[PDB]
Design an enzyme around this catalytic site. Structure first.
Site, PDB file in Angstrom:
ATOM      1  N   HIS C 200       0.765  -1.236   0.000  1.00  0.00           N
ATOM      2  CA  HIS C 200       0.000   0.000   0.000  1.00  0.00           C
ATOM      3  C   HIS C 200       0.797   1.289   0.000  1.00  0.00           C
ATOM      4  CE1 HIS C 200      -3.962  -2.315   0.935  1.00  0.00           C
ATOM      5  NE2 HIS C 200      -3.834  -2.103  -0.364  1.00  0.00           N
ATOM      6  N   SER C 204      -0.540  -0.474  -6.612  1.00  0.00           N
ATOM      7  CA  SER C 204      -0.233  -1.566  -7.507  1.00  0.00           C
ATOM      8  C   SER C 204       0.610  -1.131  -8.731  1.00  0.00           C
ATOM      9  CB  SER C 204      -1.543  -2.207  -7.990  1.00  0.00           C
ATOM     10  OG  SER C 204      -2.149  -2.973  -6.962  1.00  0.00           O
ATOM     11  N   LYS C 226     -14.514  -6.882  -9.909  1.00  0.00           N
ATOM     12  CA  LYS C 226     -13.602  -7.686 -10.716  1.00  0.00           C
ATOM     13  C   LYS C 226     -12.981  -8.764  -9.799  1.00  0.00           C
ATOM     14  CE  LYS C 226      -9.161  -7.163 -13.403  1.00  0.00           C
ATOM     15  NZ  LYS C 226      -8.291  -7.208 -12.151  1.00  0.00           N
ATOM     16  N   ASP C 227     -12.876  -8.485  -8.494  1.00  0.00           N
ATOM     17  CA  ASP C 227     -12.358  -9.476  -7.530  1.00  0.00           C
ATOM     18  C   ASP C 227     -13.424 -10.535  -7.162  1.00  0.00           C
ATOM     19  OD1 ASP C 227      -9.841  -8.398  -7.420  1.00  0.00           O
ATOM     20  OD2 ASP C 227      -9.782  -8.116  -5.241  1.00  0.00           O
ATOM     21  N   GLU C 270       4.287 -34.083  -3.607  1.00  0.00           N
ATOM     22  CA  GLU C 270       3.068 -33.559  -4.236  1.00  0.00           C
ATOM     23  C   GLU C 270       3.407 -32.734  -5.497  1.00  0.00           C
ATOM     24  OE1 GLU C 270      -0.103 -35.238  -3.043  1.00  0.00           O
ATOM     25  OE2 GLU C 270      -0.573 -33.166  -3.584  1.00  0.00           O
TER      26      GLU C 270
HETATM   27  C1  HEM Z   1       0.529 -15.824   1.107  1.00  0.00           C
HETATM   28  C2  HEM Z   1       0.412 -15.710  -0.412  1.00  0.00           C
HETATM   29  C3  HEM Z   1       0.285 -14.286  -0.898  1.00  0.00           C
HETATM   30  C4  HEM Z   1      -0.740 -13.469  -0.685  1.00  0.00           C
HETATM   31  C5  HEM Z   1      -1.984 -13.752   0.126  1.00  0.00           C
HETATM   32  C6  HEM Z   1      -0.494 -12.325  -1.298  1.00  0.00           C
HETATM   33  C7  HEM Z   1      -1.482 -11.240  -1.272  1.00  0.00           C
HETATM   34  C8  HEM Z   1      -1.262 -10.216  -2.337  1.00  0.00           C
HETATM   35  C9  HEM Z   1      -2.336  -9.252  -2.626  1.00  0.00           C
HETATM   36  C10 HEM Z   1      -3.701  -9.217  -2.000  1.00  0.00           C
HETATM   37  C11 HEM Z   1      -1.822  -8.366  -3.664  1.00  0.00           C
HETATM   38  C12 HEM Z   1      -2.645  -7.255  -4.248  1.00  0.00           C
HETATM   39  C13 HEM Z   1      -2.352  -6.895  -5.703  1.00  0.00           C
HETATM   40  C14 HEM Z   1      -2.210  -8.064  -6.652  1.00  0.00           C
HETATM   41  O1  HEM Z   1      -2.600  -9.169  -6.372  1.00  0.00           O
HETATM   42  O2  HEM Z   1      -1.634  -7.901  -7.703  1.00  0.00           O
HETATM   43  C15 HEM Z   1      -0.435  -8.835  -3.924  1.00  0.00           C
HETATM   44  C16 HEM Z   1       0.460  -8.185  -4.924  1.00  0.00           C
HETATM   45  C17 HEM Z   1       1.907  -8.560  -4.900  1.00  0.00           C
HETATM   46  N1  HEM Z   1       2.483  -9.671  -4.247  1.00  0.00           N
HETATM   47 FE1  HEM Z   1       1.606 -11.023  -3.121  1.00  0.00          FE
HETATM   48  N2  HEM Z   1       0.714 -12.401  -2.028  1.00  0.00           N
HETATM   49  C18 HEM Z   1       1.182 -13.677  -1.665  1.00  0.00           C
HETATM   50  C19 HEM Z   1       2.414 -14.355  -2.115  1.00  0.00           C
HETATM   51  C20 HEM Z   1       3.342 -13.453  -2.858  1.00  0.00           C
HETATM   52  C21 HEM Z   1       4.447 -13.935  -3.407  1.00  0.00           C
HETATM   53  C22 HEM Z   1       4.801 -15.414  -3.359  1.00  0.00           C
HETATM   54  C23 HEM Z   1       5.125 -12.922  -3.955  1.00  0.00           C
HETATM   55  C24 HEM Z   1       6.419 -12.976  -4.744  1.00  0.00           C
HETATM   56  C25 HEM Z   1       7.550 -13.666  -4.004  1.00  0.00           C
HETATM   57  C26 HEM Z   1       4.428 -11.809  -3.782  1.00  0.00           C
HETATM   58  C27 HEM Z   1       4.954 -10.477  -4.202  1.00  0.00           C
HETATM   59  C28 HEM Z   1       3.840  -9.564  -4.585  1.00  0.00           C
HETATM   60  C29 HEM Z   1       4.037  -8.461  -5.296  1.00  0.00           C
HETATM   61  C30 HEM Z   1       5.409  -8.019  -5.770  1.00  0.00           C
HETATM   62  C31 HEM Z   1       2.871  -7.839  -5.500  1.00  0.00           C
HETATM   63  C32 HEM Z   1       2.678  -6.528  -6.269  1.00  0.00           C
HETATM   64  C33 HEM Z   1       1.924  -6.827  -7.560  1.00  0.00           C
HETATM   65  C34 HEM Z   1       1.747  -5.680  -8.527  1.00  0.00           C
HETATM   66  O3  HEM Z   1       1.347  -4.597  -8.126  1.00  0.00           O
HETATM   67  O4  HEM Z   1       1.916  -5.869  -9.726  1.00  0.00           O
HETATM   68  N3  HEM Z   1       3.289 -12.046  -2.975  1.00  0.00           N
HETATM   69  N4  HEM Z   1      -0.215  -9.913  -3.129  1.00  0.00           N
END
Ligand code: HEM
Ligand code: HEM
Lengths: 51, 105, 378, 48, 75, 49, 111, 60, 51, 108
Positions: C200, C204, C226-227, C270
């Site tokens: 935040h 994004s 959209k979500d 798995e």
């Molecule tokens: C526990 C699993 C995860 C949850 C619940 C989670 C939750 C979220 C949420 C709600 C967003 C909001 C915007 C979007 O989806 O694009 C987001 C974006 C992002 N997440 Fe995760 N995420 C998780 C795992 C990851 C992983 C594995 C990575 C990479 C190692 C990651 C890196 C990012 C990044 C860099 C964004 C920014 C996306 C953008 O604005 O293009 N997160 N995530």
């Protein structure tokens, strides 16, 4: 591109923090040693030979 | 000058068309990734360019939204592509490196 | 004035999913964050109900699980939603990490690293999860994997016995895993909140990789709906599996109660680990394989320092688009290999995909970037 | 091995029938709200 | 941070918009819809498809070589 | 005081009802004919004769 | 938000006391406006073009008089309640709410 | 009759989030049942592998 | 000290929200009834007699 | 400027227990909030270790608990810290609600 940190000043800075970084390693050494009761290391220390 | 330059130039013109931002009415410098040097240069742009730049980007984001593209006629022709931002950025980099040299002494 | 804006609680909600400025731009690849969130509560919700019945002792481990599906009312959908939810969770996880790499979202250092921690965490969580029903694969998959740490010099032995609670995968080893598999998803959730906190700060990223401050839209009603739609799709996928092909992604071998002297010929983890399993055995070394397997996931944290292009997204870079999908395809090869016995073609092709994975990330993508810059006169 | 066999397939039928109604319905809901952004027209009117 | 009103500076851009209750949710859904998708596919096949068939070929071959390596004729 | 509690909590994951450890197993050799690998259970682990 | 809140409130819950204020405001505005030859001549000319008649103050009073709360919340509901606005924005409008949200503020979930 | 349908539906039941809700809840009642009839009736028609077995084995 | 809310206006306000508060109770009634398949209540409803 | 103040994470910590303006005034009755916090993690920490051994089926319920105190290394202090921690938790809880009533803290 770590060349930004390469010069006289930076070299003086590194020397200045050497005693500190050394002493901080002394703390981590003894720290692990004492915390795991390092059999290997501790045997050399007089009075800490509880065997 | 000869066949050689034209070949590199045409290899470049080919990638350009393949990169495909011109399809969104964008310009090379519009796609530049914003970092510190870039933010400052964007800041130094004069009123007109800065305004045009924002509208261009808005036109694109808007397209990229509905995943459409511009009519072929209105794509931005290589050649015709103005590196408006370049001179500013170069000077911003040139300034920073001076501080960086000064920081070594 | 307006309560939604100033109440100490709602502020959060409001600034997190109501008024939050969002790109008009973001596409379907952006739905995975919310789906990961949904996967999380789903695993927590069904997972809980499963724990109100599952008992964690070898004697009844398998039994209780069977008790669940036959006697416990609807314990079967619950059980299957759980199992399949884990897979859905991994699909979205991999999709999410995919979007990030393609679009340069990783430039957000902290958000991304929290994500790597989210990855290892949900991974570590699921490894333990599957040991629970005490099936052949559970015990054995639990044996193969745990032991890996026995390669760490001077300490692997002591360590492996320490997390074992004995000299083998015993009674100590099952209750342990139940306990951790219960507490890990709570910590996952808190860490996911910090993921969002850090995210935040910037808002994004978007498909073009160009800043969108110039064209931001409120999260509600656009991305709430959209979500919503994209969650329904995740429900379709999930339900299609549990209500039609419940065992499709599962080994039949785990339906046979564990046996410490048995040892199946088949022996694989798995599906969501196959690529990493491949990478591991492709090395004829105890330390090598393990070190390489570690480097296989921990490399997600090297990515930002390997960024080389003057553009953030890959949308306008074709050399990289090609290299990207080669990377995807190469993981698909790794998945395939890991699911096959260590014999004939498979060995060497498995060793090729391995070197490739690393060449593609550690050298080919960074280089393509420099070339694409050069081609633009940048 | 699977006493539930038949029951699930009945729900499965409902799951497809339901989703075959909800899916388009939610789409149209999401289509209707994005309406505003899909048809938005821009104009740039700089001075001079 | 964040918040509308403090994002960035923009001037001279007008935006005409229309109430959703005034327009249709699926204007020319197939009419303009399908052409677009073809276009998008075309735009990306050469970048997406090639690695996948490369895997496919290595998949079917690798499979055949496996099966056919586990039989013997003379010797 | 810190190590003590931390160690005591660390220790809580090792020994137990787990010094079954083991025996001196007695296997009749005339039960394994030429060419066969007979496996038994010893120290919670498989033993090949 | 506040402007819309008021329309909604009036649509659903105009109290009786405030309608007398509004009425009084109108009688004072009307009579205060029809003061001096110019405004009156303009009222004659416009009125004939738009009413075909000239509406005597006595009748406007009668019309004002007839309004009470029920009428207000009835008549306001007809034109305001759940209707699509025409919105025009100029200036530094980054925070002008999205139309969907301006439209959502044209009805309320409690009612 | 056709425009006035969606219209009347809006008039008498849709404005007030009250009725709008009163109807969806009431509309969920009738629907849940009518869906379970048709749905099960469908599950039966494609099968007939159990239930008419009863008419045979018992009836006492 | 609820006397602050006692007067003509407040009385008009209460009448204005009556149809709404009534309808909101109709929603909660049917809502619970349908959600718990209220044997007692539902038997009266034509077509919802699935017994 | 100062990292403790502006880092999105530390801000919290800082504004929660470092720079937070507090009365010079508050006495011992104000310690129960932090002790309740400590009681919570303690019940969570020992409670967890107890769950790595306790089994939840009537057959072994009692048994596992006994197994803990006799066989499980230090399972006894853990078991007792748990049990007593629950009581300590209630003592502080009642003390906390006490302070609130006496001092009018409930106006919040
Ligand atoms: C526990 C699993 C995860 C949850 C619940 C989670 C939750 C979220 C949420 C709600 C967003 C909001 C915007 C979007 O989806 O694009 C987001 C974006 C992002 N997440 Fe995760 N995420 C998780 C795992 C990851 C992983 C594995 C990575 C990479 C190692 C990651 C890196 C990012 C990044 C860099 C964004 C920014 C996306 C953008 O604005 O293009 N997160 N995530
Ligand atoms: C804290 C909420 C969770 C609880 C209470 C929980 C508890 C359980 C229990 C008791 C079992 C054994 C019963 C069975 O197999 O059906 C199980 C299986 C499993 N759950 Fe969880 N778990 C939770 C969260 C997760 C998470 C986060 C994941 C990762 C997506 C996960 C993936 C698994 C896996 C892989 C299995 C074993 C495979 C199988 O279903 O047969 N669960 N869980």
């Amino acid at each position: 591109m770590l060349t930004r940190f390469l010069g006289p000043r930076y070299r003086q800075l590194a020397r200045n923090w050497v005693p500190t970084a050394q002493l901080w390693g002394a703390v981590g050494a003894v720290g692990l040693v004492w915390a795991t009761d390092w059999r290997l290391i501790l045997d050399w220390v007089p009075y800490i030979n509880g065997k | 000058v000869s066949a050689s330059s034209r070949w590199l130039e045409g290899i470049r013109k080919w990638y350009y068309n393949a990169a495909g931002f011109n399809k969104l009415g964008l310009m090379r410098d519009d796609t530049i990734h914003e970092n510190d040097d870039v933010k400052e240069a964007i800041r130094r742009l004069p009123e007109n360019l800065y305004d045009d730049r924002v509208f261009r980007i808005k036109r694109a984001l808007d397209l990229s939204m509905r995943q459409q593209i511009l009519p072929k006629e209105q794509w931005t022709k290589y050649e015709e592509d103005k590196s408006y931002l370049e001179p500013y950025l170069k000077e911003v980099i040139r300034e920073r490196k001076e501080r960086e040299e000064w920081a070594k002494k | 004035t307006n309560i939604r804006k100033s109440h100490p609680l709602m502020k959060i909600v409001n600034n997190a999913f109501i008024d939050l400025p969002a790109p008009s731009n973001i596409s379907s690849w952006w739905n995975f964050g919310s789906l990961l969130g949904i996967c999380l509560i789903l695993q927590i919700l069904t997972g809980l109900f499963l724990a109100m019945h599952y008992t964690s002792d070898t004697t009844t481990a398998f039994s209780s699980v069977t008790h669940i599906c036959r006697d416990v009312n609807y314990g079967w959908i619950i059980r299957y939603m759980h199992a399949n939810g884990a897979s859905m969770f991994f699909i979205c996880l991999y999709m999410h990490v995919g979007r990030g790499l393609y679009y340069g979202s990783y430039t957000f250092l902290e958000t991304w690293n929290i994500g790597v921690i989210l990855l290892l965490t949900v991974m570590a969580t699921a490894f333990m999860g599957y040991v629970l029903p005490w099936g052949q694969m559970s015990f054995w998959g639990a044996t193969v994997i745990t032991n890996l740490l026995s390669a760490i010099p001077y300490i692997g032995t002591n360590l492996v016995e320490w997390i074992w609670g004995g000299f083998s995968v015993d009674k100590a080893t099952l209750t342990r895993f139940f306990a951790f598999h219960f507490i890990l998803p709570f910590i996952i959730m808190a860490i996911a909140m910090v993921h969002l906190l850090f995210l935040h700060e910037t808002g994004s990223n978007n498909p073009t990789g160009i800043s969108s401050d110039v064209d931001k839209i409120p999260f509600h009603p656009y991305y709430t709906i959209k979500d919503i739609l994209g969650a329904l799709l995740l429900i379709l996928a999930l339900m299609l599996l549990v209500l039609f092909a419940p065992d499709l992604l599962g080994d039949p071998d785990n339906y046979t109660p564990a046996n410490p002297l048995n040892t199946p010929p088949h022996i694989k983890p798995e599906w969501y680990f196959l690529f990493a399993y491949a990478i591991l055995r492709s090395i004829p070394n105890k330390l090598g394989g393990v070190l390489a397997l570690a480097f296989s996931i921990l490399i997600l944290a090297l990515i930002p320092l390997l960024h080389t292009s003057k553009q953030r997204s890959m949308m306008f870079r074709p050399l990289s688009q090609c290299l990207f999908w080669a990377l995807v395809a190469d993981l698909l090869t790794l998945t395939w290999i890991g699911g096959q016995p260590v014999e004939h073609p498979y060995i060497t092709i498995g060793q090729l995909a391995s070197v490739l994975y690393f060449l593609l990330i550690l050298v080919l993508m960074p280089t393509a970037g420099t070339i694409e810059n050069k081609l633009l006169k940048w | 091995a699977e006493p539930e066999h038949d029951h699930r397939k009945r729900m499965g039928l409902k799951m497809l029938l339901m989703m075959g109604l909800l899916l388009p319905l939610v789409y149209a809901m999401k289509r209707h709200k994005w309406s505003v952004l899909k048809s938005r027209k821009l104009a740039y009117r700089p001075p001079k | 941070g964040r918040q509308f009103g403090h994002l960035t500076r923009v001037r001279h851009v007008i935006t005409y918009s229309l109430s959703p209750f005034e327009q249709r949710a699926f204007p020319h859904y197939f009419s303009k819809g399908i052409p677009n998708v073809l276009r998008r596919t075309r735009a990306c096949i050469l970048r997406v498809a090639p690695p996948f068939v490369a895997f496919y070929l290595v998949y079917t071959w690798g499979t055949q070589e496996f099966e056919k390596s586990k039989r013997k004729n003379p010797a | 005081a810190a190590k003590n509690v931390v160690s005591q909590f660390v220790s809580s994951m090792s020994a137990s009802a787990d010094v079954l450890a083991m025996s001196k197993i007695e296997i009749k050799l005339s039960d394994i004919p030429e060419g066969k690998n007979m496996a038994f259970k010893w120290r919670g682990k498989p033993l090949f004769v | 938000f506040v402007l819309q809140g008021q329309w909604m409130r009036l649509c659903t819950s105009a109290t009786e006391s405030e309608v007398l204020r509004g009425k009084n405001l109108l009688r004072n505005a009307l009579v205060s406006h029809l003061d001096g030859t110019t405004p009156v001549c303009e009222d004659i000319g416009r009125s004939l073009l738009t009413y075909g008649r000239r509406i005597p103050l006595a009748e406007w009073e009668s019309r004002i008089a007839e309004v009470d709360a029920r009428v207000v919340r009835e008549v306001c509901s007809k034109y305001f309640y759940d209707q699509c606005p025409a919105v025009a924005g100029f200036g530094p409008i980054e925070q002008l709410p999205d139309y969907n949200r301006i439209r959502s503020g044209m009805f309320w979930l409690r009612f | 009759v056709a425009p006035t349908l969606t219209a009347r539906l809006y008039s008498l039941l849709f404005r007030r989030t009250s009725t709008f809700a009163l109807t969806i809840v009431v509309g969920a009642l009738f629907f849940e049942r009518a869906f379970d009839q048709g749905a099960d009736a469908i599950y039966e028609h494609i099968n007939e592998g159990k239930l008419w077995k009863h008419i045979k084995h018992k009836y006492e």
